[PDB]
């Protein structure tokens, strides 16, 4: 019995055209290019889901480094001092403590300056 490939190609191509919603120009109306761009998009996303973890890490580094020099002490010494004191607070959290609660950041900086 013959089978004609109607109504299987339509859906498959449409659910990639729709998945390319909002791409420039001809990349959001043609299957032959929408598919390539969606493939490339998936690849880029898979890389960036890793890159983000380190981009935000170094963002917290920059903020902590800026905060430390307001107290005449550098990031390297600051982190070494907290390591000596036994303090385990992420860079994310230390960045937030510096933004919000200046007194507390000063207090733990002293407790780290005194852990020399």
């Amino acid at each position: 019995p013959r089978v004609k490939g109607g109504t299987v190609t339509r859906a498959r191509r449409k659910k990639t055209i729709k998945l390319a919603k909002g791409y420039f120009g001809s990349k959001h109306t043609l299957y032959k290019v929408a598919k390539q761009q969606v493939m490339k998009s998936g690849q880029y996303a898979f890389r960036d889901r890793r890159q983000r973890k380190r981009d935000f890490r170094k963002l917290w580094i920059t903020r902590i480094n800026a905060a430390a020099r307001q107290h005449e002490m550098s990031y390297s010494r600051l982190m070494n001092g907290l390591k000596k004191a036994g303090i385990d607070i992420n860079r994310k959290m230390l960045s937030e403590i510096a933004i919000s609660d200046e007194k507390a950041f000063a207090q733990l900086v002293t407790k780290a300056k005194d852990a020399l």
Partner: peptide, 8 residues
């Protein structure tokens, strides 16, 4: 880069 509220 000296603002504790730095943003890229």
């Amino acid at each position: 880069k000296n603002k504790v509220t730095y943003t890229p």
